[PDB]
Write a protein that binds this ligand. Structure first.
Ligand code: FAD
Lengths: 666, 129, 15
């Protein structure tokens, strides 16, 4: 889109409509006449724009009014309420900009925010830019979170986030113009190679994919329409329904063979019924002719009766002879009808073992997308975030993604090697207890006005707790943690001295022998300037290949590359790296998913802050003190980076509105 | 895109754990069923096909060309009266027995000679039988 | 979730 129009769409906002969030802060306007709304909506879109064409400099309010035109600049309390709402929610002035008015000499309020994962720094940049004092507690010796960039020598390769899922309304678009990010386009051609090491026939490759999507769509219509959603008392997983669709389809190839082979016995037993009338005329003809010959034996002259016995036997045999040609005429239409029914037989199989094994790979691609076996995804809700896809081709960062958190961490107070342990939140404030990871012996106490927990959903899930909440998190939160899904996928990085793959393909598949191994090393990526290949390990294989040493994996890896490109063309890798995200201390998994029995409405329970009870009985219900960010908190954008960054912007807006007031609301 | 799911067929595969592996087995053993009474009748029919070897060819009789007549020679007066005693009202068949009268003077032949040849007396003699 | 696919983006269900 184009103009103050595309501004609103690039900020994920309906250009012609006021949102639930703006109704909150401008309930006068949304309640008011439709004219005033359009002057708001234009100011909102005009501001959003101004921020977006130049996002390396702050957008002061004074700067906004000046560039804005009449009649829309006639009102300046409105232009202030708009600009102040935007800046507070990260729609303008977020990320790494240059300040115009530098920071207040004296700060206000204290937040301790746990984890410098990307959602983490997202808030700390915003909380700090609102003149708060932010300190940042990170258990690693690095700032990335699940954004992890391997770098040895010239080689660069992401074992965590890799792909910008398209700049069409992506906040990550804003960061790219702000940060030096080399954004490489990803070309969508993916050649599947079966286990042998040779390519799938271009006709098979379209027949399987097209089938796989029709089976997917089936579960959708199975789910949202036929309402097949509980079976035997449990919720249906996409895995189950995907299978139930196939048995209704392996049933149908057989309902159609039975119907066709039963139409052959329909007419094979009309031919039988016909050839019986025809053998029984051949024989009524045999005897008549016999009788008619013996009637010509009487030599003329003959009395008239014995003349009729020749003519009658002649009329009788020409009549019974006429019937038989009708019955070998009818046998004619059947003999070719029967050779054509048998000649166009229905589908002999539903899917072959060669066919299903390629169907597998499309399920591995689903298991990558979702970091879990399809047996665990919720059938109804797994794709519930679909509506918010970004438009545009996907990309990758050729100098590595880490380059982004690292950028987002400049100017910020970050304590590394600091494993939070207990969160203590009370009506009067918060203390957070942290050890040093290196010595586990230095203990730290951090007191603060509120705590922002960007603790990955797997950490939060961990039994026994890696972090103790004091007081315990309310049941409605902990149940939302149990119900949710934190899943697994891993990455094998392969690092060679020379480019032996096809340089002009970014990514290609490998097709799995079993269903069980459908996850195992099922997809490869060539992305970086250096000879680098990169293998996904999703599915059930994800969690399994963690119990198997690096070499066995890089073995199975080179095994695949050999079959596919020829033993001789596959050198040894100079450097190799397997990820173990399910075993990583401060991850416990890869990213979240909508587990069966979960909804996206758990993603929203996840983000409701915690208000501690009254300290003194009968004291006024306090301020909320414990806030949650992270990719597992943002319903409309789960399990991405941009979704995490977005959540940190959210809370930082929420934390400021609670502790610095919201002056834009009268 | 493009899938045919009726509720009917769903529950017969979801009812229990093996109700999928069940429902497919009787289809296969009903196709094993149906594949072999095709063998049966395809080879019952193959035997009925060979018993009809030679067709009816040694048994067809040449066609008799005779231009149909008007006047009745005394012979096919009688040929008629015995066709009617044996062929009833099939004015076709009577005409090829006589062979020299078309179907209409056959029709005629009844009424103009009804008194003389007792054709009603011949006709209910036909009905007993 | 589905938005994560970059290759062979599934499509059966997107509406
Ligand atoms: C293998 C993999 C590939 C991915 N690929 C993509 C991709 O291509 N595109 C995409 O958009 N997204 C991708 N993602 C998802 C993306 O990386 C994450 O959703 C996002 O980066 C995580 O942000 P977060 O801030 O919520 O959590 P994190 O970044 O995990 O932040 C949590 C932080 O808290 C720290 N921490 C944990 N426990 C403690 C503790 N007790 N005390 C102190 N600190 C603690 C962690 O060390 C970490 O720094 C991928 C994820 C994985 C695992």
């Amino acid at each position: 889109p184009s103009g103050v129009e595309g501004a609103a769409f690039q900020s994920r906002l309906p250009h012609d409509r006021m949102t639930s969030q703006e109704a909150a802060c401008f309930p006068d306007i949304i309640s008011g006449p439709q004219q005033t709304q359009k002057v708001f909506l234009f100011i909102r879109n005009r501001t959003l724009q101004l921020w977006l064409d130049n996002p390396k400099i702050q957008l002061t309010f004074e700067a906004t009014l000046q560039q804005l035109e009449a009649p829309y600049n006639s009102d300046t309390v409105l232009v202030h309420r708009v600009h102040s709402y935007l800046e507070r929610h990260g729609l303008i002035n977020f990320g790494i900009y240059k300040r115009i008015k530098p920071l207040p000499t004296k700060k206000t309020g204290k937040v301790i925010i746990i984890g410098s994962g990307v959602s983490g720094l997202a808030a700390a940049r915003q909380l700090q830019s609102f003149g708060m004092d932010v300190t940042l507690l990170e258990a690693r010796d690095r700032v990335g979170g699940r954004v992890a960039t391997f770098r040895k020598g010239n080689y660069v390769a992401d074992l965590g986030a890799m792909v910008v899922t398209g700049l069409g309304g992506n906040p990550m678009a804003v960061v790219s113009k702000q940060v030096n990010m080399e954004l490489a386009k990803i070309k969508q051609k993916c050649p599947l190679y079966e286990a042998n090491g040779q390519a799938v026939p271009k006709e098979k490759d379209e027949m399987v994919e097209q089938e796989f999507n029709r089976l997917l769509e089936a579960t959708s219509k199975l789910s949202h329409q036929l309402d097949f959603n509980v079976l035997n008392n449990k919720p249906v997983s996409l895995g189950q329904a995907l299978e139930v669709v196939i048995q209704l389809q392996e049933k149908h190839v057989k309902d159609e063979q039975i119907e066709h082979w039963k139409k052959i016995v329909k007419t094979q037993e009309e031919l039988k019924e016909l050839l019986n009338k025809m053998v029984n005329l051949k024989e009524k003809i045999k005897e008549l002719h016999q009788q008619y010959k013996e009637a010509s034996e009487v030599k003329p002259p003959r009395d008239i009766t014995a003349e009729f016995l020749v003519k009658s036997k002649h009329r009788d045999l020409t009549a019974l002879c006429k019937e038989y040609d009708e019955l070998a005429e009818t046998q004619g239409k059947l003999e070719e009808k029967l050779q054509e029914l048998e000649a166009n037989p229905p589908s002999d199989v539903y899917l072959s073992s060669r066919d299903r094994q390629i169907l597998d790979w499309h399920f591995a691609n689903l298991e990558f997308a979702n970091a879990t076996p399809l047996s665990t995804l919720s059938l109804k809700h797994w794709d519930q975030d679909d509506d918010f896809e970004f438009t545009g081709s996907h990309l990758t960062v050729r100098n590595g993604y880490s380059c982004v958190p690292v950028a987002l961490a400049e100017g910020l107070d970050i304590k590394l090697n600091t494993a939070v342990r207990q969160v203590r939140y009370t009506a009067s404030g918060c203390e957070v207890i942290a050890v040093n990871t290196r010595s586990t012996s230095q203990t730290f106490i951090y007191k603060c006005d509120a705590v922002l927990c960007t603790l990955p959903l797997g950490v939060l899930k961990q039994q026994p707790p890696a972090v103790q909440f004091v007081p315990p998190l309310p049941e409605w939160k902990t149940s939302a943690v149990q119900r949710m899904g934190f899943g697994n996928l891993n990455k094998v990085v392969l690092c060679f001295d020379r480019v032996f793959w096809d340089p002009s393909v970014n990514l290609f598949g490998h097709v799995g022998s079993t269903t069980a191994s459908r996850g195992e090393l099922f997809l490869f990526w060539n992305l970086y300037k250096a000879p680098i290949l990169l293998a996904l390990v999703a599915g059930e294989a994800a969690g399994i290949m963690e119990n198997i040493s690096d070499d066995v994996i890089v073995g199975r890896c080179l095994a695949i590359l050999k079959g596919i490109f020829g033993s001789s063309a596959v050198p040894q890798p100079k450097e190799t790296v397997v990820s173990r995200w399910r075993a990583d201390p401060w991850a416990r998994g890869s990213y979240s998913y909508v587990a069966a029995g979960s909804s996206g409405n758990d993603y929203d329970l996840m983000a409701q802050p915690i208000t501690p009870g009254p300290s003194i009985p009968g004291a006024p219900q306090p301020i909320p003190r414990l806030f949650f960010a992270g990719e597992h908190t943002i319903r409309n954008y789960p399990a991405t980076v941009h979704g995490a960054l977005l959540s940190g912007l959210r809370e930082a807006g929420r934390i400021a509105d609670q502790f610095l007031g919201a002056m834009y609301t009268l | 895109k493009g899938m045919f799911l009726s509720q009917e067929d769903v529950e017969a595969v979801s009812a229990n754990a093996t109700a999928a592996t069940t429902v497919l087995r009787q289809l296969d053993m009903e196709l094993v069923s149906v594949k072999r009474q095709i063998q049966n009748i395809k080879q019952t029919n193959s035997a009925l096909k060979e018993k009809l070897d030679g067709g009816i060819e040694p048994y067809r009789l040449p066609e008799v060309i005779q231009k149909c007549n008007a006047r009745w020679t005394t012979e096919e007066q009688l040929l008629a009266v015995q066709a009617i005693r044996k062929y009833g009202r099939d004015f076709q068949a009577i005409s090829d027995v006589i062979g020299n009268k078309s179907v209409v003077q056959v029709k005629n032949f009844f009424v103009n000679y009804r008194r003389r040849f007792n054709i009603d007396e011949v006709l209910q003699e036909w009905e007993a039988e | 979730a589905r938005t994560m696919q970059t290759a062979r983006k599934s499509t059966g269900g997107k509406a």
